[PDB]
């Protein structure tokens, strides 16, 4: 059994597993006035884009032609998303971490009181 | 922190103590026998010890033995057994009503409460169902007896009358305890709940449901202890988890786990010794001293034999442990506090003392629990250090794997 055959099967298992789990994540988001934290909303979007850039590297490599085996454009997109998450979002939410925990605790006590 | 075992068997755990007595005649020539020192004469039960407690005056102590069920009373001043008194049954729990040893009450295994005076046994009364704990409320002078059934038994000493029994939602009372600050009574139920009761009236102030995320195994409240501050409250579970609660809030401030998964037999609060923020939790194998605020372990007590009960001498750094061995063990921790007035010269021999010193620091996990947590792949790695039949892991990592599993 060829090495490529084992590899392509592995991608097929990963892609279908991710797709089913993507189906679940989309449903809960669709299920969800409530206003979200703009920083935390951005934190979601940046790392979500990081996965697409990773998947874009998957797409560039999967193509039999491999015109861009390095996947530079996918590389750059992943870099931009990764760069912002680690050093841009993280220090700010560390400053905001104390206040965020207070509100989440504040909601939890109310929910316990209601029940 | 240096811990000294002044009295107690000094043989390996595997070797039984009764052979220490056979070799005794053989080893009498050995110099070590001449040098070894007992603190108080005649501290041994012919088979074993159940419970130990010290007088409030601090000059007397009393203990109970398996067979022939006996009640030794020892005077600290004279370093001698004041007297032995035999009982018709093995004792479960007892309290000293008087400031001295003169007055005491014993709850035996035969469903009967014994009222022992200085002269001798005074009267015997038999409760409807078997009892597991006994506590005395000084203000109202009523004895509440924990029971296997739902109801908590009430006996009033002033009137010599059995008053109505408090009714509990859940069956089985393991431990009962009273806060002298407020009068609140906490009953340790078999189910994972503690019910809090008002003494003046006859009502349940509230019921606290204990929750442990780490283990889903059902657990039973084994012990309850209040502070002289009136604010904070400790619970011992059958899973070896000790919860310290500020009673005002439902959440647990600190959860400390002992390591061997055994029940917490006793919780002692070291307020009087100095550095009030210290607490002792006692299991079958280890009694650990640790800080309420930091949770850090300060000293660990690891006797060669199973512990049945532990007691602290107020204002001093020692602990009397009722064990399954023939001799009961007396321990000394100089850093916590000084020796008493009666062991004035114990200090001089601290170098000659045994100076017993990982096991308490880390988490003991059996081989089966390793299989449950899917940690078999880590066997042989530095993460899991094998001791006896179990692999020791860090407390922080144990919560990590348990939640994932």
């Amino acid at each position: 059994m060829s090495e490529l055959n084992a590899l392509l099967k592995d991608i097929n298992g990963s892609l279908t597993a991710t797709s089913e789990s993507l189906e679940r994540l989309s449903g809960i988001y669709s299920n969800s006035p409530a206003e979200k934290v703009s920083l935390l909303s951005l934190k979601n979007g940046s790392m979500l884009g990081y996965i697409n850039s990773l998947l874009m590297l998957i797409g560039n490599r999967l193509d039999d032609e491999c015109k861009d085996p390095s996947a530079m454009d996918a590389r750059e997109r992943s870099i931009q998303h990764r760069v912002v998450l680690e050093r841009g979002v993280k220090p700010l939410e560390k400053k905001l971490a104390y206040q965020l925990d207070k509100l989440t605790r504040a909601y939890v006590k109310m929910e316990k009181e209601y029940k | 922190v240096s811990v000294y075992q002044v009295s107690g068997t000094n043989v390996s755990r595997s070797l039984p103590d009764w052979i220490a007595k056979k070799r005794k005649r053989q080893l009498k020539n050995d110099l070590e026998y001449q040098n070894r020192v007992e603190l108080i004469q005649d501290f041994e039960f012919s088979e074993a010890s159940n419970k130990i407690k010290v007088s409030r005056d601090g000059q007397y102590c009393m203990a109970t033995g398996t067979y022939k069920p006996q009640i030794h009373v020892y005077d600290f001043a004279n370093l001698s057994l004041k007297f032995d008194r035999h009982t018709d049954a093995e004792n479960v729990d007892f309290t000293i009503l008087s400031d001295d040893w003169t007055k005491s009450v014993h709850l035996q295994n035969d469903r009967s409460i014994q009222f022992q005076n200085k002269g001798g046994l005074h009267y015997t009364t038999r409760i409807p169902k078997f009892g597991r704990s006994l506590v005395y409320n000084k203000v109202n002078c009523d004895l509440y007896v924990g029971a296997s059934g739902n109801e908590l038994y009430r006996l009033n000493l002033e009137k010599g009358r059995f008053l109505n029994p408090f009714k509990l939602d859940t069956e089985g009372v393991n431990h009962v305890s009273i806060n002298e600050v407020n009068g609140l009574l906490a009953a340790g139920t078999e189910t994972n709940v503690v019910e809090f009761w008002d003494p003046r009236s006859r009502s349940r102030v509230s019921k606290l449901y204990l929750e442990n995320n780490i283990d889903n195994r059902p657990f039973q409240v084994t012990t309850t202890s209040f502070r002289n501050d009136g604010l904070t409250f400790a619970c011992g579970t059958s899973n070896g988890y000790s919860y310290i609660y500020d009673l005002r809030t439902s959440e647990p401030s600190i959860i400390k786990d002992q390591g061997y998964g055994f029940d917490i037999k006793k919780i002692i609060w070291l307020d009087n010794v100095g550095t009030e923020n210290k607490i002792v939790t006692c299991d079958k194998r280890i009694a650990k001293i640790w800080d309420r605020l930091d949770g850090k372990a300060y000293a660990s007590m690891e006797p060669s034999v199973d512990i049945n009960d532990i007691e602290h001498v107020p204002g001093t750094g020692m602990f009397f442990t009722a064990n399954e061995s023939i001799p009961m063990h007396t321990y000394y921790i100089p850093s916590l506090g000084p020796s008493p007035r009666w062991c004035s010269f114990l200090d001089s021999i601290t170098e000659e003392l045994e100076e017993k010193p990982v096991y308490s620091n880390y988490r003991f996990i059996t081989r089966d629990d390793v299989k449950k947590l899917n940690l078999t792949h880590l066997v042989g790695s530095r993460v899991l250090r094998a001791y006896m039949h179990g692999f020791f892991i860090n407390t922080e990592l144990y919560d990590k794997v348990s939640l994932i599993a």
Binding site: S21, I51 | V181
Partner: protein, 267 residues
């Protein structure tokens, strides 16, 4: 009334925090694809030889791989448009709805990805500037006036070359299929251990995993006495005397304390 806004705000915070845990789970499942993908060939000849090893089976797997990949990424872009729509990241609602309805090709999907990244970048600049100003005012740094976070994005994005080298580092020591053959034939211009063609985000993947592990922990008949008798027992009569002093606390404090047992514009 302000409690309701705080509780609802906590709900929104919780919803988002769960969303990270779901998307990181998406990353975890995709991890083996990235490891596997980095092991694939790099040149046309290597791919052709890989197919020549098993022509029929490889062709079938390739067709399924293309179908699953296209279906998955189209759904991702649909989620991206909806996600960036609901969170006000994209302001043109009509255009977003039209994109969702229409079915897109691989090249068209690439156009959306370039776009969706572009609005995200604009939203990125506005959000970082806003919060960085807020924290600066909150911490008194406004009184003082430690770079702005958005400026930090510009600076380290200016340092492209350094971080590209970080990705190119081969920590796992992955060797793509027929790598030696491509090297010998000179089909790999960039190379002519750090390898440009293998992508390594192991530390970033681990850091996210350590963070995910961390949050989970922090969040985590009269005979024998069987019947009761209330009659007086003389021997125990007056066995002890009650203490007249009573509890150290006052009764009012105890009653207050038990009740707390276990739970012009003024403002």
């Amino acid at each position: 009334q302000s409690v309701q806004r705080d509780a609802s705000k906590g709900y929104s915070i919780l919803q988002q925090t769960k969303l990270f845990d779901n998307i990181i789970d998406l990353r975890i499942k995709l991890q083996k694809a990235v490891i596997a993908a980095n092991k694939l060939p790099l040149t046309t000849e290597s791919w052709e030889e890989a197919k020549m090893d098993d022509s029929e089976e490889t062709k079938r797997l390739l067709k399924e791989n293309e179908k699953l990949f296209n279906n998955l990424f189209n759904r991702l872009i649909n989620f991206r448009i909806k996600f960036q729509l609901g969170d006000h990241i994209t302001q043109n609602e009509e255009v977003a709805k039209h994109k969702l309805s229409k079915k897109r090709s691989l090249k068209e999907l690439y156009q959306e990805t370039n776009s969706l990244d572009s609005e995200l970048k604009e939203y990125r600049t506005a959000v970082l500037n806003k919060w960085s100003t807020k924290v600066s005012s909150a911490s008194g740094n406004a009184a003082l006036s430690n770079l702005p976070a958005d400026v930090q994005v510009e600076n380290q994005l200016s340092d492209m070359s350094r971080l590209m080298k970080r990705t190119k580092l081969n920590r796992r020591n992955i060797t793509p299929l027929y790598f030696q053959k491509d090297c010998a034939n000179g089909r790999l211009p960039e190379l002519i251990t750090e390898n440009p063609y293998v992508f390594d985000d192991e530390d970033f993947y681990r850091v996210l995993l350590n963070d995910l592990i961390d949050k989970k922990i922090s969040n985590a008949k009269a005979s024998k006495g069987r019947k009761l008798n209330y009659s007086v027992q003389d021997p125990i009569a007056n066995y002890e005397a009650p203490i007249t002093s009573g509890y150290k606390w006052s009764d009012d404090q105890i009653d207050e304390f038990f009740a707390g047992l276990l739970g012009i514009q003024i403002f």
